[PDB]
Scaffold this active site. Structure first.
Site, PDB file in Angstrom:
ATOM      1  N   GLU A  25     -53.303  13.732 -22.152  1.00 21.09           N
ATOM      2  CA  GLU A  25     -54.363  12.740 -22.583  1.00 21.09           C
ATOM      3  C   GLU A  25     -55.582  13.175 -22.219  1.00 21.09           C
ATOM      4  O   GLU A  25     -56.535  12.700 -22.979  1.00 21.09           O
ATOM      5  CB  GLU A  25     -53.718  11.395 -21.863  1.00 21.09           C
ATOM      6  CG  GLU A  25     -52.750  10.551 -22.630  1.00 21.09           C
ATOM      7  CD  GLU A  25     -51.441  11.397 -22.251  1.00 21.09           C
ATOM      8  OE1 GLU A  25     -51.332  12.298 -21.630  1.00 21.09           O
ATOM      9  OE2 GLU A  25     -50.228  10.775 -22.722  1.00 21.09           O
ATOM     10  N   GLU A  78     -43.414  10.184 -20.311  1.00 19.94           N
ATOM     11  CA  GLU A  78     -43.146   9.116 -19.519  1.00 19.94           C
ATOM     12  C   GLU A  78     -41.972   8.299 -19.585  1.00 19.94           C
ATOM     13  O   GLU A  78     -41.479   7.770 -18.784  1.00 19.94           O
ATOM     14  CB  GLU A  78     -44.280   8.051 -20.211  1.00 19.94           C
ATOM     15  CG  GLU A  78     -45.682   8.453 -19.122  1.00 19.94           C
ATOM     16  CD  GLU A  78     -46.915   7.814 -20.117  1.00 19.94           C
ATOM     17  OE1 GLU A  78     -48.093   7.969 -19.389  1.00 19.94           O
ATOM     18  OE2 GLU A  78     -47.178   7.777 -21.290  1.00 19.94           O
ATOM     19  N   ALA A 133     -47.312   8.475 -28.417  1.00 16.45           N
ATOM     20  CA  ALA A 133     -47.613   7.495 -29.240  1.00 16.45           C
ATOM     21  C   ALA A 133     -48.072   8.405 -30.766  1.00 16.45           C
ATOM     22  O   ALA A 133     -48.454   9.482 -30.584  1.00 16.45           O
ATOM     23  CB  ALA A 133     -49.024   6.918 -28.778  1.00 16.45           C
ATOM     24  N   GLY A 163     -46.135   9.627 -23.900  1.00 17.26           N
ATOM     25  CA  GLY A 163     -44.992   8.576 -24.131  1.00 17.26           C
ATOM     26  C   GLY A 163     -43.577   9.126 -23.660  1.00 17.26           C
ATOM     27  O   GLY A 163     -42.951   8.732 -22.853  1.00 17.26           O
TER      28      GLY A 163
END
Lengths: 266, 265, 266, 265, 266, 265
Positions: free
Chosen positions: E136, E116, E68, E113
């Site tokens: 994170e 992911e 992100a 992300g």
């Protein structure tokens, strides 16, 4: 602290123990202490092997349990709300897992944790004038005692949703019509018609194999929460437990000798 | 257009009505209606003010007759599968709409039509309304979630019989089997179920918007896994309401013996 | 043997095969041989491609199936009961997995394995005078034919628990009210009213597309045991199987020509 | 004295150690150690400051040999089931501690002892530490959750072989089959695994407490259900970190190019 | 615009569709716009009929996707974050559900992300010096693109917890060692070493039957998240879909005539 | 005649071997071979004395190439599926055998061959041996449980690649990806794996047969449900070994410093 009384019934009620919330000053609301004594009592019944049926009721006519104590709650920091509610949720979940058949006798109001606690019981009975419901949304919260899980499983997703969404309260007859309770009663002079029925119903449980009753409860409870095939595997393993028991043999011999079995839970 | 979307106002503000309007095709799920319905649903997903959605028909006597058969007849075998899956998809998105949903069945609801209603949280139909899944009479099966939602809502047995016999029911019967929550006499305007829906929706408006949304999640998500995990989902959902402005308003409103003023935060 | 008869009805009822238990001398109890015959019968139909719907009934008035034969069990050692009972659970589960719609016609007593045999069917039809239940707990054991799994799924956990805890037996009327059966009617002078109705309902299933009927049963049965998202994928894969069949084209043509379809099952 | 629960300080501040000290009887899960342990683990569920927990032994060469065989011979079968379940129960609570847990195997870990280790999130052991589930050789099976956690940690095949054979592995092997994440050569003091576990915990300390706990919840819960539900659990877990002061601190710290200083909220 | 480009490789790669991320000034970060563009491309491809394999990679050397965009996040009211993150989680999951095989060619940094997204792919290939991880917790949040779900599944719970907890960042070599990737190779002078390898691997998939490959993916993805028995039924329903295909007979015929199969996706 | 059921004795007493002898077809799964395999496996389920089963090929260099292509090409649309389900149903029955199962892969193992192996608790294979699931190259997909057992055995990603590329592996490669638990070098007899299987199987003979059975039960069942229910199953299984004479013997043998003499019961 007197607010919770655990009685072990005698004579014809031998095998039945009773848990009676007694706290009129707080409408039997779930105060920090009430759930400790409650938790304390539950953990005790877990191991208690002479019990055969547990009834949960109130000793305060017109009230079963109003749920969490809004008063104490307003004094809790946001970082404390969650932990406390979770405590409520866990003690109720412990109730849903008590070894023997459980019966909630609603003779009065039962909201939030009140109904949620009753939802943890296997069977629920109530006077027609008793009022119950999950009204959390009206306060911008949600049932935190498992109501979001047990209500939908008990009366169906759509109806459970309508009730939570509207935070609507039902009376005995409405509760019975939606399936929330198995038996609706006509309140009597002493306001304990529900408790009365519960006692009677429980007696119907006393004459059965204590060991059978427990594994049967396990098979049902565990199996409903997994695929049917696995559920079948669970039944087989619970049934296996009744095989090496004396009661299994005392039952086959009871009919041979035409007489009431004298099960011992062995 | 063939799909109307409107945000009611005043004592109904907070209610969005999705109205199907294809009298031409009996509100059948055409490639276009499905496209529009999809946009409608995704938009509403993000809407911050909606507190309840009502799905109804603006054509008396008909709710939605399922998939358009004229189009299917022009579809190649390699097209059918993907198309029905597109239908199953949108229905499921509708099943996952954030706020409470209510289907207002005032007409014929067959296949896709009924499946759309089954995706809603609550169903209300007029006594004279006819609904059902008759796919087996056509050598196929419900492909809009029916085989899944029908048994979940009314039980395996009753759902199987209906699918095996491809039987159509009326409002009275649907209320008897629990297919709908509210049944009532169709009025002369032909919008009985819709009206009832509105009265029921209004009963939702007063509650904390945040609470209502995660409450739905705890339910929809909790039902599809074991009870223990469900309880964890319940804890996670509750957690979200704690740090909200509304939770306090709730307590304050109580303390000041007055109606709450929730703002969804 | 005359113990278990298999009637392949035809012309008007073509597609309907009936399974009739005929152990009148033993209240149709699930004897060792009956199981073996029942299993073979099922496995046989399990693959029969003509079948469109199966009905399970008794050819002995007033009796459906008394469940496990208390007599043979008497002559069993503890290291054998489990395996035997598990054998029953397996056949009854085989019945549940039959590829076509199954209806259980109950015109008489249905206890234990008998009632469990019926729960394995898709639809249950009984006469208001017929009795049924799971009385295991009275004997110090628990339902071993899948009852602990199928009774809670069919009428809900709470009632299911009450019927098992108290070992209560019900009649068609009560069974209808609890949701145990989907059709209840008055018994006729022939004592075969359930069968009559069951047969009538089976006829409604005949016109529908055969392949579509089987994958529909797979979708529902299978989807009910996993999260809804998976069930949707299962529905999808079941539906895909009807796409390239001749019947689906025949269906769209019949609709166009405004006529009755001619489904070949392919 | 049989159970030491220490709150370390200095560079280890935030690490809580639970040391089993009962060389007297090879740290066997006796009726007492259990009661004390449960009390300890419960206490930790509510410990506001803890950021990581390490479970180890203070008796060189022995981790925990599992259930007390001496006591087991004194109880009737009517008492066995319950006590074994009590074990499985306390070990399960250890598995659901809110913060990261590390089991340091510097000695013998058998039955409950190894099951206790599997309840932790991460395992480290000395290459000469012996561990295993030998229940079958005694006509019973692992009753401390072993039958469930071992297959989960090392896979069905391997777990079955280990249990069917009741074979004992050594650090190196345990490491080979994945039973442990970190293996190292034992040291004079006989605490090489513990020392390594400390340096692993310290790596955890700097991260935001709330995110860390919800991260564990999302992982532990999501693994036991379908992926889709798990993604919803993730979302609900992530949501709990949005309204936290630590979350802004993280972004604030990143903007100022400095190490963040999380306080939990 | 060209922040994301979709290429339909031809010649010897016909069937392969490369999806590249060309957003260098923001380290291929998941911004509102890239997420949107990405979602459309994914949706489109989801219905594309000639695709045999999809390869996701970056057009920027040394970078795969840093997750992100912290920039947009800083400028994001809390009530906006949850919604935007779920949107990344959703798109990444659509990716996880693509019809044909998917390959993630990690040739640079893959954070949050990014990693992911890579986990949403069926197979991951990465240059040995590539950096990847989920950090994170270093920011007081948790992975929100599926990481708490796909990481433990991919490499196991213990290893997944430790990576998340320490927010550690691994390199291609260390990733291959823990099972986070399947193929690892030294980077090249072009910076597209992983991509080149992914192309060679993608080519291996081309000669197979399109339909089978698809339902095969459905069967593996879906059956993995449910009990095995149900899983076996999903395999049955997926196999069924290959039976009425023309390709099934091509394989057989091709075998008999001892020669290469010529499948056309039907 | 093509399937040899043999109950070994003296030192191997307790072990039974399933020998696939059918070289005139590469041991392909023929409607007849399946027939026998099903009946043999159906009887072994009731065998009291069996303590471990070993599936092997009596035909050197070949384990099992799967379903017989020939018979298949002689099957109409309608017959294929029903038949493939019979393979999946039996291989599944195999996976459910009451005692430990070891697959000795001493030769080519493809399709139903490998799937037959995946159904065993443990897989031992020669380093030269070749095994794979190449259905996709044939425009079909693994139909004996492979799309399910393989992914659970070696991981989703690896399983996807093996099935998508439809490549074949050799013992060595099967080892590195976890497809098999043991790898040897093939001997002159061409039965390396078999020999290992027997040795390995001998390590199982001593343990309590009852414990062994309910252990497989707990492991197999718990892996397919949530962890919490998994622990319940373990409890219910542990429960079954409590009232046995074997358990008491276990405590007795130990006490009297002597090997355990178990015999079910």
């Amino acid at each position: 602290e007197d607010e919770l009384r655990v009685r072990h019934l005698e004579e014809e009620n031998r095998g039945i123990v009773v848990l009676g919330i007694n706290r009129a000053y707080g409408k039997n609301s779930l105060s920090k202490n009430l759930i400790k004594m409650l938790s304390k009592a539950v953990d005790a019944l877990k191991s208690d092997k002479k019990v055969r049926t547990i009834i949960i009721r109130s000793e305060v006519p017109g009230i079963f349990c109003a749920g969490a104590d809004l008063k104490e709650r307003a004094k809790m920091s946001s970082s404390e709300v969650g932990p406390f509610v979770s405590k409520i949720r866990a003690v109720i979940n412990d109730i849903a897992n008590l070894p023997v058949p459980t019966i909630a006798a609603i003779d009065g109001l039962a909201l939030g944790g009140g109904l949620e606690l009753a939802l943890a019981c296997d069977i629920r009975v109530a006077a027609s004038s008793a009022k119950m419901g999950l009204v959390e949304t009206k306060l911008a919260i949600i049932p935190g005692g498992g109501g979001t899980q047990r209500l939908p499983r008990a009366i169906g997703m759509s109806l459970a949703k309508e009730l939570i969404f509207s935070a609507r309260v039902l009376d005995g007859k409405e509760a019975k019509a939606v399936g929330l309770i198995s038996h609706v009663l006509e309140q009597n002079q002493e306001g304990d018609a529900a408790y009365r029925k519960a006692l009677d119903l429980a007696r119907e449980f006393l004459p059965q194999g204590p060991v059978a009753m427990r594994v049967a409860k396990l098979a049902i409870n565990q199996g409903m929460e997994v695929d049917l095939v696995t559920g079948l595997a669970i039944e087989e393993a619970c049934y296996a437990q009744t095989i090496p028991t004396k009661d299994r043999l005392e039952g086959l011999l009871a009919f041979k000798e035409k007489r009431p079995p004298r099960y011992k839970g062995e």
